[PDB]
Structure 1
Amino acid sequence: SRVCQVTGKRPVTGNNRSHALNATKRRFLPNLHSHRFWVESEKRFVTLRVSAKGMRVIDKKGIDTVLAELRARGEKY
C-alpha cells in the first residue's frame, strides 16, 4: 500500500481545523518515492519505495545494513 518500506510511515489521519475551528476528517500521506538504488555488494540496481526521511536513513547508514534489516522484517526488496 502507501507504506515506506524502510521506515514504515503509515498514512495517518487527522482533523483539519479551519479558522473557525470546524473539524473535518483528513488523511496525512507520507512523501513516498520509488527509487532505484545501487548496491556494489549485489552490484546491481534495486527498487524500493521510500520517503525522504527514509532516503536520509539510506544516506547515513549503509544500504547493505538497511537491506539486512528489511530481510529481518521479511520484506521484499
Structure 2
Amino acid sequence: SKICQITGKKAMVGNNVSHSKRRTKRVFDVNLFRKKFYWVEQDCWVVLRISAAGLRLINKIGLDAAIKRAAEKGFLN
C-alpha cells in the first residue's frame, strides 16, 4: 500500500515510446515521501506518507481540513 494518504494517488502504468515508436511497459511513480506535521488543532505530531500534491493541498487548506477530507474520502487508511 504505497499510496498517498491525502489524495489517494498511486502508481500509473504507461509506455516508454522511442523515436521509432517502439513501446515498452513502464510505471509512473508517485512523488511520495514520509513527513512529520504539527497538528495545531490537536497540538500533537503526526507522520504521513504523502505526495507533493498532498503537501500542496495541505498548504492550501490547512492540515486539519486535509486530514478530515482524506478520512471522509477513505484515503487516510
TM-score by length of 1: 0.88
Unpaired stretches in structure 1, ≥5 consecutive residues = none
1:13 aligns with 2:22: no
Please name the residue that 1:54 is paired with: 54
| Aligned residue pairs, count | 76
Identity of aligned residues (%): 39
Deviations 1:22-46 (A, max 9, x none): 1100000010010100011111110
Q: Distance in 2 between matches of 1:71 and 1:3?
A: 14
Runs of 4+ in 1 over 6 A off after TM superposition: none
Are the equivalent residues in 1 in contact too, given 2:7–2:70 (CA < 8 A)? no
Instruction: Specify which structure has the bigger relative contact order, considering alpha-carbon pairs within 8 angstroms and separated by 6 or more residues.
Output: 2
Please name the residue that 1:36 is paired with: 36
Greater shift in the superposed pair: 6-15 or 65-74: 65-74
Unpaired stretches in structure 2, ≥5 consecutive residues = none
Deviations 1:10-62 (A, max 9, x none): 20100110121111000000100101000111111101111111111110001
TM-score by length of 2: 0.88
